[PDB]
């Protein structure tokens, strides 16, 4: 309804009308990911959640709903998240890490050692829906 006022985090000054910049970044990432091959999981996931974020932010018109129906932090954190994603896209295009080597092995271990209930273990709440729906498309 009004301006963001304080963001609650130092060094993260409020960006007025962040929806426009966020949409711009999402569009640039969507139109820049065409370099890497389709078949790979990285593209298959970045296109997925970038497109989901673009649709969910274009449906809404204000920050207090954009961050609300995402639930992925404040509308301003998404800005540097998208900027970092674009930087990663560019760097990995420069790296070109594609091509599965013919002599490739990967010893995947499934060790299951129980630990007590009183040791420091990260036990957070469930993720939003898109984080789970992305892996369905990634696998299939």
């Amino acid at each position: 309804a009004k301006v963001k006022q304080t963001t609650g985090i130092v060094g993260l000054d409020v960006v007025p009308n962040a929806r426009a910049v966020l949409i711009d970044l999402y569009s640039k990432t969507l139109k820049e990911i065409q370099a890497v091959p389709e078949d790979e999981g990285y593209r298959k996931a970045v296109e997925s959640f970038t497109r989901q974020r673009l649709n969910v932010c274009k449906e809404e018109e204000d920050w207090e709903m954009i961050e609300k129906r995402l639930g992925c932090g404040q509308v301003e954190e998404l800005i540097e998240e998208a900027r970092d994603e674009l930087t990663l896209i560019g760097k990995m295009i420069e790296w070109d890490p594609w091509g599965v080597p013919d002599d490739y092995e990967c010893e995947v271990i499934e060790n299951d050692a129980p630990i007590p209930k009183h040791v420091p273990q990260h036990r957070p709440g469930p993720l939003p829906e898109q984080f789970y729906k992305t892996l369905e498309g990634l696998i299939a």
Binding site: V100, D102, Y104, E105, C106, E107, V108, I109, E110, N111, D112, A113
Partner: peptide, 10 residues
């Protein structure tokens, strides 16, 4: 309980 399986392609 140790499941140690090594991957391989083609």
């Amino acid at each position: 309980p140790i499941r140690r399986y090594v991957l391989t392609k083609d």
